[PDB]
Amino acid sequence: MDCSTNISPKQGLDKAKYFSGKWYVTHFLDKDPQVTDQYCSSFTPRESDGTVKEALYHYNANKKTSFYNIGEGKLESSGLQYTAKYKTVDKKKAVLKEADEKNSYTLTVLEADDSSALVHICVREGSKDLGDVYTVLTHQKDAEPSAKVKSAVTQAGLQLSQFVGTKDLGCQYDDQFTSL
Numbered sequence: 001m002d003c004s005t006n007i008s009p010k011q012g013l014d015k016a017k018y019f020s021g022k023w024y025v026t027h028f029l030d031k032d033p034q035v036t037d038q039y040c041s042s043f044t045p046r047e048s049d050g051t052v053k054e055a056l057y058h059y060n061a062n063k064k065t066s067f068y069n070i071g072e073g074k075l076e077s078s079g080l081q082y083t084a085k086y087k088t089v090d091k092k093k094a095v096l097k098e099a100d101e102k103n104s105y106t107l108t109v110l111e112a113d114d115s116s117a118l119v120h121i122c123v124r125e126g127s128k129d130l131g132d133v134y135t136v137l138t139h140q141k142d143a144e145p146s147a148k149v150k151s152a153v154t155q156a157g158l159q160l161s162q163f164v165g166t167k168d169l170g171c172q173y174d175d176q177f178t179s180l
């Protein structure tokens with residue numbers, strides 16, 4: 001499995017629109033058929049002087065379990081795109097594993113407006129691409145994605161109907177974790 005290659009950030013994006021509020025994933029497209037569990041995700045990205053920090057949450061909708069991470073990376077010279085190393089943490093942000101040199105993710109912002117975003121995430125370990133996920137985001141749980149972001153899906157060469165919608169998954173969020 002190789003992460004999707006036709007990936008670079010949309011030029012002209014206002015970073016203040018992306019690094020704002022919090023995001024909830026309303027739709028995701030995970031390329032790997034062997035990932036049968038479905039997830040919900042929410043995260044709160046912030047940037048200062050080209051360094052991105054973000055508290056990240058996953059909910060496994062089948063097992064009904066949640067896991068927590070803090071990513072830290074540098075903005076690329078290309079725009080709204082960054083490769084993050086990450087801590088693994090508990091719900092209180094106590095560190096279980098510090099960031100390391102072999103585990104990372106690369107997030108690329110493909111569209112972002114006042115209400116909504118389309119981002120791509122490649123999770124890697126060493127020489128290996130572990131996960132490839134496109135996510136449509138909104139600022140509130142089950143809010144409708146913007147027309148501009150729906151266009152961006154099509155612009156990315158994708159079909160929104162092929163994504164998994166998170167509304168029907170029985171998502172549970174931890175809004176205290178993502179606040180900050």
Ligand code: HEM
Binds near residue numbers: 035043069131
């Ligand atoms: C609903 C959208 C998403 C789904 C379906 C999804 C799916 C997954 C799955 C299946 C795993 C592997 C879990 C395991 O077996 O340990 C995972 C891990 C991971 N995801 Fe996501 N993900 C989502 C959103 C995101 C977001 C938005 C980010 C970053 C902003 C992200 C970053 C990561 C990272 C860093 C890992 C590795 C965590 C670890 O190894 O402990 N994912 N994701």
